[PDB]
Subunit: 462 residues, 4 copies
């Protein structure tokens, strides 16, 4: 069995949910129809490391419909949907992923996506978080200098370092010969992208890399629209609270905060915003939101939402000043936006999964969601498929561009070209009934663009 | 054991949830504090027939805190929350309710709320749907005319009639004796209020009844704000679908439909509305919604919501014209807004509990929610506590008024007096931080009102 | 010349503006087309007393297209548009109206609409404010008892009383014989309607009267939609102020205040509301508005809008606490919502017409619009034609109903029947592209209405 | 008299309006207070060419309060407010501007800002549209090559070239001598910035230039918020039309179109959008607007707004398909968004100033605003002061930076540094009551920024 999944019997269920997801992921489905004849990924052998969910499944089969051969693993030990994995295997793709897998299994499975049968090699990486890429790069270094895997600080490292030693025993140059076949990497997260920029700095980047995280279509959907669609859903599943008439404070008015504010206001909450950036604060104010400090908000608001990407924006003294049964949640950085640690010295009482009462020295209670982790993933189900369709359609056009024209690119990190970012948007228009107009020749000349785009300058903010 | 519940062990859990709910139900709690000293319900013996949930538990303990003696049953066989029932019993109230009870047990439990110890009788009814009222009125007539309980249309009538026949054997004047002791009824639903108006018309109403359904505070919260708060919640739990960019059609632009349109629009849907009432249609047009026909919408919309209270507003031929994986749901009348029965001829495939695929001959599928029953109750959790607080504060003030001043009233159906309706609203203001202003003497005279209210004429529409 | 206008030469201009207004008044234009064949007003001789504007002109010619003969005057000395009057005369209708006419001329012109040539008599009154109706009723009394015009308090009375004495000299029973021919009155304002209710009380109402002021379509358009369309326009014409980011306080959250709040929020103002009615306050709160006292708002808000219909809701001490260059206006009762009188002791400095600086003892200035009169009429141009189309379409269907079936009605004040209120709405649907649906027989029975309406019970609030 | 204005008598009026405007322009006023002591512009001699309005007067006196010596002209022959010019002259600034001046007078006035007394020279240019900059650059080249001012395309060039030829006769090196003294230019318009980038490309830029057009604060206020605030204002002054229930189409969904759509929707219009950019189109779809074609909209919409910056986006055949009395206007490029010229073949009829009927052969009419020029400027009063405060605070900070630190800059076009852009926003917060928060040291390090800013990376889109 060239796969490791929870239970292949879950395949039929997975296929039914794939069939449903496809309708909500028109960008991916339309790429299949458009590039059918050309088979642009014929000859591509893609190693993929990305949350093994139903939506990722639609991406896998798009890559296959375009001609790719694919091996897949999850980028997280808990994010796999076992029935999705099952259905993808049943359809003929090696998957090494199950929910609740150990760290040892995680790093093993990250090797498996790079062990192709019949003397073959992966020639593309599709990554989320950069673990797959990190494995080849660090393993290659360990070949020359074992010391780099000699002193593991944490738990993830013990498992990573150990897995590398195990493969160096199979083949003393296990990693470098595999790295030599990679034609391109496409990466979609902030952390993965930071890692690539550092490799480039260190002269350690041996192929072109596409930063897809910073495209307009990916960032708007992943940040603004995705969280707008999901904040209130998580709050309601957890608490069933009435939103109308409540004071809700959103910390941060970037893309995530903008979406949060908009959804809360759409239900009749009074929305306050906190900010450290005066441009963002002024944007919030021009939408009729009151811009306040968290000190001011702390004893007044009913609902607190953190969207700053920063550290301890809701702190011990804020919570201490809070109203009884104030609801506190986080939709920003995966942790530490709220100082949950500083409340651990007080009585807690579980209300239900991902919902807890914290009881302060005076008997005043606060309701905390997902233990200060991401409310949209802990109390709801994360981004809807249409949102993920925009992210994954980016990843797909990036794979096509590097596999197909990667020789035109240096061994550097590149943001997706505007014309492909525009194409991502265009691929989603028919689903939602939007009719795109066309410039005439005179009009294209008049505003100084090609009829085919790109339509805006690189500095354009949308 | 003067109670029948699922499991008395659930009491501690129920008490924890009651403690949470109280903070979201300020009308009930503030009533407890305001009327504490007066104990206006001392000497009241209330037979209640109302969904035995955590929220109803808060109402029950409010009635008790005001001096009432109380016995309770559910008005529905499936709506009971067993931990709620348990906590209320443990706190000293007879309850006759558990989730999933039978129709035989249902009607028996309806008798038990009228069986008081120490030779005492119920003197007040707090009703939802009118079953408690019906039992006594039908049963009383059946004492002198067994023909009324002779021809059961219906599985519910079969159970009802049996229980009457069974009690007639114990005492030929079981109902009669009890009916004569009722000083008043308070009723909060359309169905219950229709039954009362019909009794009044027939001269069969032997006590004053308060119609609390048609109060402004009750109708607004129960119809408009409640459904606004919970429509999308149900759709998202069921489907996790992206709302932005979708065409959603709402059939009906009354209170319910107004709330629906408003929540869908708040998330970036294009909202279309159908209507038969030109006034309601013009209202919709003035908020920027296109007013369309269901025939026009059938093959164009992505989301269908029925809010008409009418019959087969989505029919077989509409569903057949629908777009593949269109979502169809009902938030209006309990059933028959959608012609679900006409699709039973087709293969169905369950997606998950309360979510079904209907497969048409050409392979096109429709996603139907809650089998065409109520999506906010089937796929979500129903109205939030603050909403129910408005309905139940209406019931409480109605009980106080009829118990303490019923002599002032005739044997008719009255809508809650405007000043009590205003009181319901007022009791909810402190929670949401709304500061009410006071008229001066000059100002009250200038507009022709008392400083204490009521503030509007009886025909005022708000 | 059976007319008195400013200048008949203005007719061509007026006709051009009539032709423009008709497109925006589909209710009136559609009545013409629908009732063409029937000529329901053939035999009607309508005396009309209503602001002689372009929009009223479209009403006059609708009445004529339906078969009426008409004589017209203004209900206000300043509201006439001279080119409208000119165009209506040129088309063959006697008009007695010009802007800036004296009180003597006003009362003379009110007689002229009741002096028909060739021994004829008016048999219908179309009134706004009840002056026309008052003339006949009071004149009739003076015939029997001169004392009722013996002691005039004010300026309007001196002119009224004098005009009556003058006509009693022509014909000692000038009024009563004219009153005897009136088959019906239709009245559209609050004041006019109060006067009718008082006549009825006093047994002094000799014909049926329609209160059109309280119809749903007239009240929603005249109160809510009209002021929503126009508040910000008046503020901007006067001040050119940026609305976004300002705190704007609306006193009152009835129909006018509701519209005001909604328009201000639509431009990104932070909107606060004050209220004395807790139901209205709770409505405001459920839309996310903060409900505050004027004492709280006075030193904080940038923009103050009064919509209460009450007395001195913005008072001396409020203005004294105001921020420098706060803008103060009134869209409610025609005066005394603001205590402008109490500021008259302080320096004023005109900024431009209808805009004044008030300079307080400490040098802090406030900007007052229209001297505390109606901002939408003083700084903008009042209600748009579509709004007036709803009012006047009411007046027209009321005229048709009383002329045509007035024998079915007692000599009482009646609100317009719901089926005619619905018809008003329906007549406006085609213009705005709204497609009204139709009940089937089964559906009409199911919800208990006729297919033709009315569709809602009398107590329905919309 | 070192000035040329319409009437110095208008000065007191102008001063009154300047005093009002100041309260709505907190960025300029707060700059005066903050930099008072430092007098950073002491030694600066600023030649300004910018619309001589009341708002520009506030900018001028801010520059003076900071130590600058200043001479001023308008950048447009018709934009001058004569009372503003007068007040600024009376307060001691040479101004060369009056409303309705000729092109000959225009260019002469442009020379006068460069003629300083006591043998001194301008050392800074504050420009709008780039005419002041062009004069010196073109004129300098013309000294050594008279061919550049030999072939005038254009009535404006005829005037420009004459004035250069006239000054060349007085001094063959008139421009040269002056050009060499310029330390910097600040430019705020698209046209001016394009000219600067073209000079830079040709190596013809002898000093650092700040592009203030593309700052976030300038572009947002000038493009989005400014047009949002004033679109409907213009339409209503022109037509007094009802907006609710109308279909309004906005061509373009960039900054301007985004603001338009938002204001129209806020009043209950159904808003459709056209676009050629799929990203912008998806943005519109995500806010619930239908994205349509102008061909589809042509015969359906009631209101047409062009915001594309493109050429003939409304053409002859669109207008011919339009609904009778459709309103057509342009808020985008100064002209040629609508093919007005193609309708000159038809009879026109003026409705009023800036409002015209275009009469088609079949008698169908279209209402065109401002003859297809800018409706916010033609039918209203342009941007409000708070908006202009953001543009002019940008200019002020740009002047301070180039004057005090220009040595740090090369002879290129720079966009305003992000930290100054942030400063513009910050300076506007106190007015609107927005409370900015401060990062702690730990928080600044955690997200990788200085506590003082800048807070975002250069590619951040807001
Ligand atoms: N929950 C999710 O599923 C999800 C999805 C996408 C992104 N994110 C995360 O959300 C976070 C924010 O994302 P974004 O795209 O909005 O980033 P952003 O940088 O665009 O916006 C963050 C905002 O927070 C403000 N801020 C920083 N510190 C603050 C403080 N101490 N107080 C008040 N405001 C402060 C900044 O000025 C900034 O405008 C990131 O960590 C991102 O990774 C989460
Ligand atoms: N889901 C819930 O939890 C919940 C809560 C409250 C009320 N309701 C129910 O929702 C239904 C509607 O309630 P409401 O308060 O909005 O009633 P309503 O009478 O105020 O509104 C119903 C609207 O539907 C329109 N309508 C009737 N038949 C139609 C048809 N064939 N096509 C288009 N429109 C049609 C009517 O003209 C009307 O204006 C009722 O059955 C009510 O009991 C449900
Ligand atoms: N400006 C116009 O062109 C125009 C058009 C229509 C109506 N009106 C007038 O506007 C006024 C209001 O009309 P409406 O239809 O909204 O009336 P309404 O009675 O429906 O609403 C008035 C509201 O003001 C509140 N109120 C009374 N005194 C108050 C106080 N002291 N402080 C705060 N709130 C207070 C009341 O509770 C009420 O809800 C009336 O005088 C009406 O004639 C003006
Ligand atoms: N009226 C004013 O006072 C004022 C103020 C600021 C800017 N503007 C002007 O408005 C215009 C637009 O400004 P912006 O900042 O929105 O520019 P922008 O580039 O941000 O937006 C223009 C939009 O129009 C779209 N477009 C181009 N041709 C089109 C076509 N044929 N059909 C449909 N869409 C088309 C583009 O795709 C684009 O996204 C510019 O000319 C600008 O100078 C006017």
């Amino acid at each position: 069995q060239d796969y490791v999944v929870a239970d292949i019997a879950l395949a039929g269920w997975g296929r039914k949910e794939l069939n449903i997801a496809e309708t909500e992921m028109p960008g991916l489905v339309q790429i299949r129809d458009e590039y059918k004849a050309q088979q642009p990924l014929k000859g591509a052998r893609i190693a993929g490391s990305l949350h093994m969910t139903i939506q990722t499944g639609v991406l896998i089969e798009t890559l296959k419909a375009l001609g790719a051969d694919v091996r897949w693993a999850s980028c997280n030990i808990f994010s796999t949907q076992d029935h999705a994995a099952a259905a993808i295997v049943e359809a003929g793709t090696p998957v090494f992923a199950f929910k609740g897998e150990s760290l040892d299994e995680y790093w093993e499975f990250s090797h498996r996506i790079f062990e192709w049968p019949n003397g073959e090699f992966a020639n593309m990486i599709l990554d989320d978080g950069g673990d797959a890429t990190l494995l080849l790069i660090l393993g290659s270094k360990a070949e020359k200098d074992r010391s780099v895997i000699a002193r593991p600080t944490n738990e993830e490292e013990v498992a990573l370092f150990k897995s590398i030693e195990r493969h160096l025993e199979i083949d003393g140059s296990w990693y470098s010969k595999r790295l030599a076949h990679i034609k391109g990497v496409t990466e979609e997260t902030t952390t993965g992208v930071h890692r690539l920029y550092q490799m480039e700095k260190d002269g350690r980047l041996p192929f072109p890399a596409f930063n897809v995280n910073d495209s307009v279509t990916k960032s708007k959907f992943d940040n603004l629209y995705g969280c707008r669609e999901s904040l209130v859903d998580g709050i309601k599943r957890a608490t069933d609270v009435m939103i109308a008439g409540k004071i809700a404070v959103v910390a941060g008015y970037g893309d995530v905060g903008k979406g949060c504010a908009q959804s809360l206001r759409g239900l009749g909450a009074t929305v306050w915003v906190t900010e450290i950036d005066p441009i963002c604060a002024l944007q919030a104010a021009m939408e009729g939101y009151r811009v306040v400090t968290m000190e001011y908000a702390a004893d007044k608001a009913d609902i607190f939402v953190t969207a700053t990407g920063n550290y301890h924006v809701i702190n011990h003294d804020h919570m201490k000043a809070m109203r009884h049964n104030a609801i506190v949640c986080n939709i920003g950085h995966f942790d530490s936006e709220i100082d949950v640690a500083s409340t651990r010295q007080y009585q807690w009482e579980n209300i239900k999964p991902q919902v807890d009462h914290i009881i302060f020295p005076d008997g005043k209670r606060v309701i905390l969601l997902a233990e200060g982790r991401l409310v949209n993933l802990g109390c709801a189900t994360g981004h809807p498929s249409f949102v993920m369709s925009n992210s994954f359609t980016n990843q797909t056009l990036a794979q096509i561009e590097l596999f197909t024209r990667g020789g035109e690119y240096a061994n550097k990190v590149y943001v997706l070209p505007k014309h492909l970012d525009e194409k991502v948007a265009r691929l989603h228009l028919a689903r939602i009934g939007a009719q795109l107009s066309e410039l005439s020749d005179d009009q294209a000349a008049y505003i100084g663009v090609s009829k085919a785009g790109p339509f805006k300058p690189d500095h354009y903010r949308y």
